[PDB]
Structures are given as C-alpha cells and as structure tokens.
Amino acid sequence: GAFSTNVVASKELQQPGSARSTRHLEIELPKEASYQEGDHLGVIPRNYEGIVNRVTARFGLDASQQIRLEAKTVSVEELLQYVELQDPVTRTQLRAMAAKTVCPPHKVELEALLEKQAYKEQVLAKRLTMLELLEKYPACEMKFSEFIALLPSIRPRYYSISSSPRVDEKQASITVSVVSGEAWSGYGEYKGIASNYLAELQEGDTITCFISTPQSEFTLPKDPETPLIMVGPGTGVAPFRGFVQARKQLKEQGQSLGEAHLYFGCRSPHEDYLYQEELENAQSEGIITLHTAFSRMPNQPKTYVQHVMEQDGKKLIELLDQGAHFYICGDGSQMAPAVEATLMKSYADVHQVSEADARLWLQQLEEKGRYAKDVWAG
Numbered sequence: 001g002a003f004s005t006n007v008v009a010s011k012e013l014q015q016p017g018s019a020r021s022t023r024h025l026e027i028e029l030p031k032e033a034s035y036q037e038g039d040h041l042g043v044i045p046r047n048y049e050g051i052v053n054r055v056t057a058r059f060g061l062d063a064s065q066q067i068r069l070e071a072k073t074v075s076v077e078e079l080l081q082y083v084e085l086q087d088p089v090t091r092t093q094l095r096a097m098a099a100k101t102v103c104p105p106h107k108v109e110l111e112a113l114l115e116k117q118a119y120k121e122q123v124l125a126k127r128l129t130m131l132e133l134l135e136k137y138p139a140c141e142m143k144f145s146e147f148i149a150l151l152p153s154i155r156p157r158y159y160s161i162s163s164s165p166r167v168d169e170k171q172a173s174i175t176v177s178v179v180s181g182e183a184w185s186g187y188g189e190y191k192g193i194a195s196n197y198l199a200e201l202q203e204g205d206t207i208t209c210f211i212s213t214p215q216s217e218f219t220l221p222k223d224p225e226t227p228l229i230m231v232g233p234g235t236g237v238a239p240f241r242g243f244v245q246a247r248k249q250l251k252e253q254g255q256s257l258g259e260a261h262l263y264f265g266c267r268s269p270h271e272d273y274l275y276q277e278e279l280e281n282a283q284s285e286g287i288i289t290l291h292t293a294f295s296r297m298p299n300q301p302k303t304y305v306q307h308v309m310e311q312d313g314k315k316l317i318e319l320l321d322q323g324a325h326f327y328i329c330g331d332g333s334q335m336a337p338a339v340e341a342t343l344m345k346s347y348a349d350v351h352q353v354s355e356a357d358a359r360l361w362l363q364q365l366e367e368k369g370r371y372a373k374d375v376w377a378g
C-alpha cells in the first residue's frame with residue numbers, strides 16, 4: 001500500500017575510482033508504516049530521462065505534449081512513467097510491429113522472431129525490447145498510442161532493508177547495486193531502471209515505496225545468545241547490516257550476545273568493501289566476527305566466501321550442531337548454490353556421512369526455521 005515520502009540521504013558506498021556503483025539511501029517512514037529486520041522496501045521507480053527521450057525521438061513527439069488515450073489529458077513524458085520500457089519484446093508486440101511494417105524484408109525478420117528457437121535465443125536470451133526494434137525499424141508505422149497500450153505496467157523493485165528499526169523505527173536504509181553494462185541486445189549501453197533511478201535521487205527528493213515482509217522469514221533468532229552464521233558478499237551484506245544494528249542495540253540494552261560470524265566478500269578493500277568501517281567497528285565491539293574474502297587483489301589468490309567457509313568448516317558445523325541459524329543473502333544464481341554446496345560438504349566431512357545425509361541434514365535445518373535465504377538473481 002504505497003506511500004510517498006522523502007529521501008533523507010543518498011550516497012556512494014564504493015571508493016573513488018571504482019568502475020561500479022552501490023548506493024546507500026535513507027528513507028523516512030510515516031506514522032502508519034513500520035518495519036523489522038529482514039523486511040524489503042518495494043520501490044515504484046521512474047524511467048530515466050535517456051530512455052524516455054528515446055521514445056519521444058522515435059515517435060517525433062515533444063515530451064510535454066498533452067494527450068488523451070481511449071480518459072484524462074496527461075503529458076507524453078508522464079504517460080511513459082507508467083509502463084515498462086525494456087522488457088523483452090512479446091509475441092503480441094512483434095505481431096503488432098509486423099502488421100505495421102511496409103518494408104518487406106523487415107517484416108520477414110520480425111515474423112522470424114516469433115518462431116520458437118529465434119524467440120528463445122534472439123529475444124529472450126538477449127533481452128531485445130520493442131523500443132530497440134522500433135529504433136531498428138524507423139519505417140515501422142506503429143503509433144505512440146498503440147506502443148503505450150501494448151506495454152506492461154511499471155513494476156515495483158524490492159530492496160533488503162539494511163537498517164534495524166531499533167535504531168530509529170521511522171527511518172529505513174537500502175543498499176543498491178547500480179546495474180549498468182553494454183546491453184545484451186547489442187543496442188548501446190544498458191541501465192537497470194530502478195537502480196539508476198535510486199542512484200539519481202538526492203536528499204530532499206520524494207519516493208513512492210512500501211514495506212514488504214518476505215514469504216520466507218529472515219529474522220534474528222529470538223534469543224540473542226543463539227549463534228548465527230551470515231553469508232552475504234557484495235550487496236548481499238545488506239540485511240545483515242540491519243542484524244548488526246539490532247545486535248548492537250540489544251547489547252547496549254544489557255543483553256548478552258552469542259557468536260555471530262559474518263562472511264563478507266568483495267573485489268578489493270580499495271574498491272567495494274561496503275560499510276567496512278561500521279563492520280570493523282561492530283567486530284571491535286564484539287557484535288560479530290568478520291571474515292572477508294577478496295576476489296581481485298594483486299598477488300593473492302581469488303578468494304570467495306565459500307573458500308573461507310570451507311577452511312572454517314569444523315567450527316561452522318559445531319555451531320550449527322549447537323543450535324546456530326544460518327543465513328545467505330545476495331546472489332541466488334551462482335553464489336548461494338555454491339555456499340550451500342560447501343556447507344553440505346563440510347557437514348559430510350565433519351560427520352563422516354554421505355552427501356544424501358548432508359542434504360537431508362540441510363532439509364531438516366530449513367524445516368526447523370534455521371536456514372534462511374534472502375537471495376535474488378542478477
């Protein structure tokens with residue numbers, strides 16, 4: 001149930017000279033909103049200027065032109081804030097373009113993409129959009145009013161809140177990796193919509209957002225003495241920053257804290273060691289034990305989080321046999337499965353049991369509520 005609120009801070013987490021960006025934003029919450037560690041912020045993004053301007057150039061329109069679809073009048077530039085502009089082209093979109101195409105070979109090409117293999121390999125695997133194909137085919141006679149009606153409604157993007165409400169219940173932070181690269185479609189440079197939107201926000205800007213609690217619970221154990229193992233390289237650190245803040249307040253309120261291991265991984269401490277100072281300070285203060293893995297250090301082997309976990313396997317498996325909860329956040333496509341595989345291998349090795357037994361062990365851990373994931377694909 002979306003609300004509109006102000007940005008209180010917006011800044012760069014990576015170091016000067018990094019070729020990449022990760023943003024930290026703080027966002028104010030109204031009275032009616034609240035959150036918990038492990039919650040998500042749903043952000044309704046705006047489409048960036050460059051992509052809007054590509055649409056208006058292609059159709060020969062002024063951004064400010066007032067129009068009415070068939071029922072209020074609204075500007076072209078504002079209508080373009082309601083739709084997705086870089087989803088893969090759909091078959092309905094392709095058929096629509098083909099019907100409006102007056103150069104025969106260009107119509108053959110569009111219709112070729114409807115076929116099973118071409119669509120899979122040339123549209124979906126490359127993320128080729130309707131807009132890119134309209135730019136390739138300036139003579140395709142689709143109208144603006146038809147373009148806009150064929151597109152999907154703009155979707156929320158989700159971010160793992162990276163603060164604890166025990167610090168300030170009405171302010172939440174998020175930690176955003178800025179997606180950009182050469183477009184897989186081959187049409188210039190790609191910018192992820194919500195991450196570049198958030199990247200451009202500044203203090204004082206307004207944002208429309210909502211609190212969303214995930215289906216799979218991602219929360220601290222009830223007892224602060226229960227041990228924790230947290231694996232969150234890169235932007236996967238985000239929810240665990242929240243857990244670090246909650247533990248810090250629990251300690252300042254007199255509670256006694258158990259062991260908490262944070263496995264953090266990034267390219268280099270000279271580039272993308274997010275929240276390094278706060279995390280080094282939490283460690284000094286006994287809130288966590290920090291284990292870092294640097295993947296791109298001159299004169300050192302490439303080290304990932306799971307390589308350190310495997311060295312620490314006896315200790316991690318001992319903590320788990322004592323009741324620890326295990327948490328993975330960040331990349332779900334390659335990192336999370338490898339971290340899972342390493343944990344299970346450590347169990348098999350420590351307890352001299354088979355891999356099927358290790359998988360059943362992990363399955364039971366999940367069923368007890370002690371193996372949680374906040375992961376996403378990228």
Ligand SMILES: Cc1cc2nc3c(=O)[nH]c(=O)nc-3n(C[C@H](O)[C@H](O)[C@H](O)COP(=O)(O)OP(=O)(O)OC[C@H]3O[C@@H](n4cnc5c(N)ncnc54)[C@H](O)[C@@H]3O)c2cc1C
Binds near residue numbers: 177179180191194376
């Ligand atoms: C539960 C959950 C929690 C999350 N937590 C966080 C978080 O804490 N921090 C964070 O940064 N993200 C998080 N995400 C991811 C986030 O919601 C967005 O998906 C991410 O910011 C990308 O959105 P976007 O709008 O910028 O890019 P979009 O415009 O939506 O594009 C993203 C898509 O573009 C594809 N793509 C990437 N590069 C290229 C390229 N060069 N050419 C063509 N296509 C490309 C991607 O593979 C993906 O399919 C989370 C996601 C989920 C589901």
